[PDB]
Subunit: 383 residues, 4 copies
């Protein structure tokens, strides 16, 4: 929890004042911040290009202190980093700590120039003209690390295919919809909760969507909730929590410890009652201006999921809930006793987006007022 | 019809090849195109700033030919243009015809530099530092005209307030939602249909929203359908049509004459049956990738509009329709005991956006396939 | 200085974590934050529409505390606000304090829905159908206040015409260039310095550009430096400083007290030596990744400005400086003794943008390395 | 020439009216257009994912006619397409011709939903939950093809690395600067000229940058000029031309045949005189609002490239030229003792962008007027 807190403080400083970032850099120090930034460069530079073992140095300096890391990249292998000297590495990237913190965790347009220093094959051990492979592999190696040092907008469809989540590809085509409804939050220091880590009780299974969310939300903290243990996936900005979406107390404990959440995604049991329980408990805890997403609406018709093989969808099914939420947004126009008090969902659901197998709920203040009484409601009133 | 066609050709060439624009400029000529561009400038420069009567010259040149216009701006007065010599007018703007066509009807980011020439008070009415009012009115006048010569993104909320449509302000707050769902089409040569011009049978009334759509869609042709005549609102890129949204034949005639439409907006009678008839007839005619919008969902509960004062909403009411459209998007996941072929709305509705008093329908191909049979449907399958 | 500090803390919290904003709201309290937000609504809602005197209520609530303000709008008059009851004002806007802080000072896309509550003529004292003026003036009045409650992107050309600065209109056409080079910083908590407040020694003169920068940078602190007093213009997010751009010590004192600056604009004396002194002293103090802007390059040829009526421009003139800066960006490719050490401007100028009467300097690390020795430099080397 | 013209007509119609697209689809027909679209899909879907041989079907329909293609993807292998029946292929993508034309060559935001149909493993090779590799390879294959069917914004840095051009990586870092200055033209039907195809006189060499420009400008026609033959690189939207940048007649011939150009990039000999000759001849031919780019400013100091090893840079060297262009932008503010008429570069250069080893020149109208005579020029004037 102190670890998540330290990464968060760096993320927030990246988007704050110069004085705030200076205070944090002075407080934590280069030795402590550097490894967090190298961890990000490794996660973002993946995957390594199809090249022979090639070393690339990253040097971070701050107020007279400098730390050097040598990253090793090779076709089909996890990129590795080591705090080591760089004098014999002809591929080098240099950064002021303030610049690298912004490059990785800063909001706003990626910088096109001036964020770093570069040394590319200024000396070659081969001879005078560097070998073809040496030159080719060099270009690819330094380019891969540079790509991992920044926050250039990624393509969520490509990320989904790379991390192997079923949010994109033949089973579902949700990623462009996520870009539409969540893209305005990409530069924001978000806390995202996804219910359903993936992999069920299979050992070593799941986390694909969580890694995608970590990559897309460069300033985000990703939380994954599952009834089964997923602690093996825990990493920088990615925390798994063991909890049951059927139990309101367990849901509230997740929010009490890791919330509040800007975005909540239901991709869990798909059991009709669990979807409803999760929305009733977490929608009031969701940040106002946030988005609640329900994936796999098809379970509405599957008895094995507490659904009913009937259309219109049976009450207590996800499609019936979505239809009621739709009418709820119009609560102020509905016939009601003056004493009527709107439900939480009626007052706090400002937008409903329904697509195939997915719904997006926008939380906000639904209180613009019903059509005034002085508006004609009949030709009788017109006349 | 030839007039609407000429403006359309200019708009389409503005986003085409150099050869296509060259061919159109050669065929129509400067004398014909320039008045279309001046009309746009007058429409987009409005309103005139709070200044005393001030003249600004606009000169358009093309392949050895040049035409001069002098615009007159004054507080509270309609901006006027006359084809006259620039002469002594000390506020001047010059353009190559190609640059002005792109500036007014071109897609893409507004140019920040190099699109025109300018002369500002090289000669004053004193012979030296101009009078305080001459300088202030001069800056305001030339700035107003230049603003009218481009396609810089407008604020739809401010346009709705300026043109006085109820789409924004206290009765409704729809304009930001329109920006969200129609913003991607602002650079497109769209044909927009709004059912409901406004003003009912009152003389000289309506057209506020149509003027807003003309200002927002700088490459768009705006069509307003109304059961009553609204020909007095007719102007460049803005055509009114007399037709009844309750009658499928009249809706089809509107589409056959002025379609197809990228965007259709129902802001008409608000009578439940008319909303259903308009959607059933025009949704199939809407361009795929287009957006159908229904305003005033409240009439769902008003008996005077064919509504029923009950909740859940009665069958045959707009909210009930929206709930059925929502379920139809999931048609591939629904149980179908025998041969089923999806309805048009099930197959062509890809997205439903429901807010307070407004719904946005995205038309497309809804055929990604239902969940495959090999997917577990129960722990017994597990 | 405690005032600037308090507005800054609110601005930074608007773009931080939920916990950070909660901590600040709890610390300062609604009573202290509310007036800062009302001050912004008045500055941004200006000008009032051409309407008869109309009242619009803004109500801000936070954790069981609520404060009500009544804004009065009238054709040709400064919008006024008073902490007052709202029961008899039929035009009302309601906000949670967290939502209003983000709406005014938050980074990111303006919210399209759910940020506030609205009451529009639910009761009219006139009768049942409100009068035409009453209805028309109402629409305009509430719309104007709503526009002042947010950060919807403004048009810098229109702002320049409204505030009456010569950056746009016949004398200059710089505002679209400012949008191009400074637009990526609009959502950033910037500190901007403009040298030249305007109005010279004329009493009550100047500040037009400063008000424009305050309006455009909704999260920004605007600083205006002038040899003459301009304290009468001082307001929320807008501080004037008496200092001389000819004196390096006075320039450094401005940066020591109000810096560091993300953006510095020279629109002052236009005296060739003052432009050079200002750039030599403040470019090293400018934030890396920031922009230095020099307006009115025409003084390069005006003897009355220490210029020379000659072309090519004489050494010590702004155009000559810009040409040397241009060559300086290529310092690594220039013939030099190996011992050569790049100047500050050579090492820290990554981009030079020259337009008519204006130049934009991008500060960053100019250290990608010169063309390697192993690159053929002659057909002799080729053969 | 007719082939380049047919692809150009398709691209222009993709951003035109419904009527214009309808007319082109009727005139050319599905049989003619579909192979152009399949060629784009193969170019944009590359590279194939690291999978075992997998087939993906693409079906395009138009007014009662439908054609089927089966694409084959395999690790390290060139993606192949064949016009064959979809048959049993379990990975399928369907498109209406109009939707596919817009998806590949349309301007504007990529569509997030409704642009196509899809079938994914409705039948597996086991009869039940597909084999682990069948499912993984299936997701990768269909995703790769769908990616190739659209105009989603690419990362120019990644494209430069994928196509292996030195515009990015250790020798140069220009691609983000290209995104800044050319990004606004990505949705435009551009004609781009790069002087310098690459590969010199080595057999089979060059074209890396030309392939990058084709991928980035999804509506663009790419032209590569080189003194040596590069016809082997010729492909859809990518034409090589043999011409000498030292010879004004050859540069004019390139423009007369394949112009006018929205963007011209000098990455050729790097010989100082050739850079000056190319700019003097082609800048007047460049579209106003267009961008002229000069790479490799370092040759300014290299005697083997006509440079002089001195600083300040010698007259007749590229850096000296850039310094003179910078001063020319201020031509209206310069003292002119007698009648002066500005040069072409003074009148048509509106912006100069100088970075390390690269310059971006914006062409436009540089005529805002010098400072008016009534402006004080001295405290004596004050
Ligand atoms: N009651 C419950 N509470 C929480 N998680 C549950 C649950 N029942 C099942 N789950 C988990 O929900 C997950 C659904 S699979 C999630 C896949 C992942 N989101 C991706 O897109 O890659 C499984 O891992 C399962 O263990
Ligand atoms: N059956 C029908 N067919 C078409 N238009 C109809 C109609 N019944 C009523 N209308 C028209 O629908 C309009 C509704 S008011 C439209 C307001 C306008 N869109 C604005 O925002 O400014 C009226 O002008 C009315 O005459
Ligand atoms: N040496 C100096 N140091 C600082 N400011 C100076 C100065 N000499 C003159 N100035 C101030 O520079 C200003 C130039 S006018 C600035 C106009 C303003 N930026 C706008 O665009 O609206 C004058 O107010 C003048 O008093
Ligand atoms: N006079 C001349 N006219 C045209 N091309 C020339 C030339 N002299 C040399 N060239 C060509 O200029 C090219 C320079 S290398 C181009 C690299 C390519 N743009 C890339 O980024 O991948 C060589 O292919 C060379 O043959
Ligand atoms: Mg799932
Ligand atoms: Mg309405
Ligand atoms: Mg000035
Ligand atoms: Mg090069």
């Amino acid at each position: 929890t102190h670890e998540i807190e330290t990464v968060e403080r760096i993320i927030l400083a990246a988007g704050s004042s110069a004085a705030s970032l200076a205070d944090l850099t002075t407080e934590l120090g280069l030795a402590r911040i550097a490894p967090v930034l190298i961890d990000e460069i490794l996660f973002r530079a993946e995957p390594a290009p199809d090249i022979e073992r090639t070393e690339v140095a990253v040097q971070i300096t701050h107020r007279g202190e400098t730390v050097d890391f040598v990253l090793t990249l090779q076709s089909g292998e996890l990129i590795k980093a080591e705090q080591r000297p760089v004098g014999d590495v002809p591929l080098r990237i240099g950064y002021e700590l303030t610049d690298l913190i912004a490059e990785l965790f800063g909001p706003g347009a990626p910088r096109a120039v001036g964020a770093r220093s570069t040394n590319f094959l200024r000396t070659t051990t081969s001879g005078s003209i560097p070998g073809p492979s040496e030159l080719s592999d060099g270009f690819q190696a330094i380019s891969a690390v540079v790509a991992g040092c920044g926050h250039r907008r990624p393509d969520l469809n490509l990320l989904a295919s790379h991390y192997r989540t079923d949010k994109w590809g033949g089973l579902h085509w949700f990623t462009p919809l996520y870009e539409r409804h969540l893209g305005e939050f990409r530069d924001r220091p978000v806390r995202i909760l996804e219910i359903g880590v993936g992999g069920y009780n299979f050992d070593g299974g799941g986390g694909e969507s969580l890694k995608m969310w970590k990559r897309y939300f460069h300033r985000g903290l990703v939380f994954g909730m599952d009834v089964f243990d997923k602690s093996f996936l825990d990493q920088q900005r990615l925390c798994t929590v063991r909890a049951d979406q059927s139990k309101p107390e367990e849901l509230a404990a997740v929010d009490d410890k890791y919330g509040p959440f800007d975005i909540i995604i239901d991709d869990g049991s798909h059991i009709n009652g669990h979807v409803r329980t999760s929305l009733e408990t977490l929608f009031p805890r969701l940040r106002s201006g946030g988005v609640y997403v329900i994936e796999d609406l098809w379970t509405t018709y599957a008895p094995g999921f507490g659904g009913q093989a009937q259309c219109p969808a049976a009450p207590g099914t996800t499609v019936s809930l979505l239809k009621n939420l739709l009418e709820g947004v119009q609560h102020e126009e509905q016939p009601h006793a003056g004493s009527y008090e709107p439900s939480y969902l009626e007052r706090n659901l400002v937008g409903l987006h329904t697509y195939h197998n997915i719904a997006f709920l926008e939380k906000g203040v639904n209180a613009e007022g019903g059509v005034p009484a002085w508006v004609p409601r009949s030709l009788d009133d017109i006349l």
